[PDB]
Amino acid sequence: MLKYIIPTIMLMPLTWLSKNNMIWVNSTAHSLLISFTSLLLMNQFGDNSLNFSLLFFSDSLSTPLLILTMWLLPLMLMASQHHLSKENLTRKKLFITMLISLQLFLIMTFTAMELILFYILFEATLVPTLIIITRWGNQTERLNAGLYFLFYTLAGSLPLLVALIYIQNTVGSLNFLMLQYWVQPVHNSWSNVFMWLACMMAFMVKMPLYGLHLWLPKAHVEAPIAGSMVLAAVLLKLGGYGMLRITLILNPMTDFMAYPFIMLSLWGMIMTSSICLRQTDLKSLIAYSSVSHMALVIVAILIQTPWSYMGATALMIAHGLTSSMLFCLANSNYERIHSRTMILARGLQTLLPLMATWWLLASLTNLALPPTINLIGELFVVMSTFSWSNITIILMGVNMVITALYSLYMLIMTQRGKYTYHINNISPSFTRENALMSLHILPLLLLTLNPKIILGPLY
Amino acid sequence: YLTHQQKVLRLYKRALRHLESWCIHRDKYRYFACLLRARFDEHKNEKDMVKATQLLREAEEEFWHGQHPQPYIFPESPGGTSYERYECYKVPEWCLDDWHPSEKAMYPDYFAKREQWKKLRRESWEREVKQLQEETPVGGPRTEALPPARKQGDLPPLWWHIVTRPRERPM
Amino acid sequence: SGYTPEEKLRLQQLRELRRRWLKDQELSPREPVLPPVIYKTYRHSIFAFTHVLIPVWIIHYYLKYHVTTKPYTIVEKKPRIFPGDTILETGEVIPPMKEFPDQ
């Protein structure tokens, strides 16, 4: 993985040694080159994972998440450089450095063989993410958003550390390849019940599980655009990736331990989808939309079927592009009217015809129109949970209806109707913004032609 | 807020429109419209205003019982089939400010005339604001009525968004 | 219930402006200033070439040399055989039916 670690590290001297007016050009250009080389990780085999060294490996689960991570860095750079234009040069370079350091931790997190190494990197992502929100958010309550985000995580992550160290003592190793062969069944006991919860609750908070989700809308409303993009697209999936890995060593106890979380997820997805129908902050609506989509991922992971794991992988990738695109669309309006209130600026299709098309496409993928990979992932989960219990189709189907309702409600409210009379600063869409939207949706739709590369190891 | 005279006249018009929805045919409507008018002409000279209010209240109870459940609506009236149909084509005039210079070059005559209006607007604004200050009592406006211009060369205060509003059929 | 003299004067003043504004929305003669049966068959003949013949060439080439070269890609319902038919592949003759009772 050094061919990705080192050039990512070199982005830092590139940014600091660039001419003052070239920092965005150079960092964007070279981060795109790193993203191109990331496609060499597609050398996956049917039986064995791609095991580079004693520290790093890449299977079909981590590879799509790696590609998404390195694709997202140039997009965040493009999305950030406008609202940071007045920032002084050193603080701009520090901002870009946080984004680069976030990529560094993320690609190492997704490729670590040993689970303590994954833990340290998994925890290290907190620092630049917290700094990005509290330093470069606009509003007063970004400070509280940082503390909620920080302490929700550490409330779950410290028990995980204790469990991980306990598991190594008992088993002798935390190398994930070793765990596949030395794994032993988890028998029933109160000790194993708390081992299970310690192994899982940290990832539940990240997803976030319904009932542990209130940090997320708080974080999004305060974060700058790049913060929301990485948070929605990658940082949530750290918990999804963590669960997909650690469930290996939790059988058969997951059989009955999953129930309360499945109930929270299955009911939570309806609750959060309904909440979206009444949200007045556009960013908060997209944040609640993520909670609803990630509830499906949690169910998929917990029921542990080949179909559910494939759906979970596709849903995680598909949501990452879709939700990141929606924050970018929401942010493009915000950079004109300086408000996140959804009802403030209406009828924008009359004023911004092509941005209306991007809104339309983002909404269509959000409601999982066939054959977008959004639907492929959702459909696979719906398929698998029906076998788990046929009654789940009722909650799955109802959630589909509500998702279509709030997705299109977003579109109708902001883009259709009459334009607000007094808002007279809706300038034409910039090339940067149109490129940013298209750099989300085009790869997302191209993945329809070859979905297999996002379906994960169970494919 | 509405006078008694306004309430009776509103009811008469509303009653006649629903009667037409029922009758459909013009000859039938003419006949029953005249009968309806004769019911209003009967109590036209009622000077006891408590009695007059009783007449109107019963009349409105009668209307609610006898109204057409699907009355005719003019196509562009609120609730009609063409209401707001052309709103998507109405584009505010400030949007032309953002036109690219090559787009503006396609209409040199139009954009020179637009500059004269923008100059007329800029030079008039202070007098409009001053006229409204002088004519507004201490408490502020008590109604929404706006005044005319009082001198020569003055424009009626707050005219821009009335005068330059989109055409009803803008495209 | 008519207008008041101030209402009439304001409406008159606005009306004059609105009509002058509407008059000014008329384009000039030079606007926009822009930057610098045989026809039936030919237009129909070029359309048939580009939108039918070329597409069918491509599809036929694709079906013939890529799709039909793989098992079970184009599966036909086999032809119906009636009493009295002759099979082309083998020359077999299908016997007639038994003679009908009169009806």
Partner: peptide, 12 residues
């Protein structure tokens, strides 16, 4: 008569 059609800029 031909009337100017007010629309948003399409150049961008």
């Amino acid at each position: 008569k031909r009337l100017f059609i007010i629309k948003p800029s399409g150049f961008y």
